[PDB]
Amino acid sequence: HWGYGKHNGPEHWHKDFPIAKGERQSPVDIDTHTAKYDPSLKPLSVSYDQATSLRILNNGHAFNVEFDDSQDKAVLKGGPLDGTYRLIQFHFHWGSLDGQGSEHTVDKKKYAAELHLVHWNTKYGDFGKAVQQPDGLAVLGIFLKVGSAKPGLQKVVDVLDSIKTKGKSADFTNFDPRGLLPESLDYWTYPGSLTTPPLLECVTWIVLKEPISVSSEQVLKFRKLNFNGEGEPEELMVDNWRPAQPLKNRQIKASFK
**Does residue 150 belong to the site contacting Zn ion (CB under 5 A)?**
no
Out of 116, 150, 166, 221, point to the residue binding Zn ion (CB under 5 A).
116
Q: Which residue, 161 or 188, has its beta carbon nearer to ligand VQC?
A: 188
14 is in an annotated binding site: no
83 binds ligand VQC (CB under 6 A): no
Query: b/e for 165-198, b at 16 or more Cβ within 10 A?
Result: bbebbeebeebebeebbeeebebbbbbbbbbbbe
119 is known as an active-site residue = no
- The response to whether 12 counts as a known ligand-binding position is no
Is the CB of residue 111 less than 8 Å from the CB of residue 103? no
Span from 126-134, 163-171, 176-184, 212-220 in contact with ligand VQC (CB under 6 A) = 126-134
Residue 104 as a binder of Zn ion (CB under 5 A): the answer is no
What distances in angstroms separate CA 183 from CA 41, 58, 175, 217, one per listed residue?
A: 19, 29, 19, 22
**List 7, 61, 104, 119, catalytic entry:** 61
Does residue 196 belong to the site contacting ligand VQC (CB under 6 A)? yes
The C-alpha atoms of residue 89 and residue 67 are separated, in whole angstroms, by 6
Question: Does the footprint of ligand VQC cover residue 180 (CB under 6 A)?
Answer: no
List binding-site positions for Zn(2+).
91, 93, 116
Annotated binding site for substrate: 195-196
Which residues in this chain contact ligand VQC in the complex, by CB under 6 A? 116, 118, 127-128, 131, 139, 194-196
Interface residues toward Zn ion, by CB under 5 A: 116
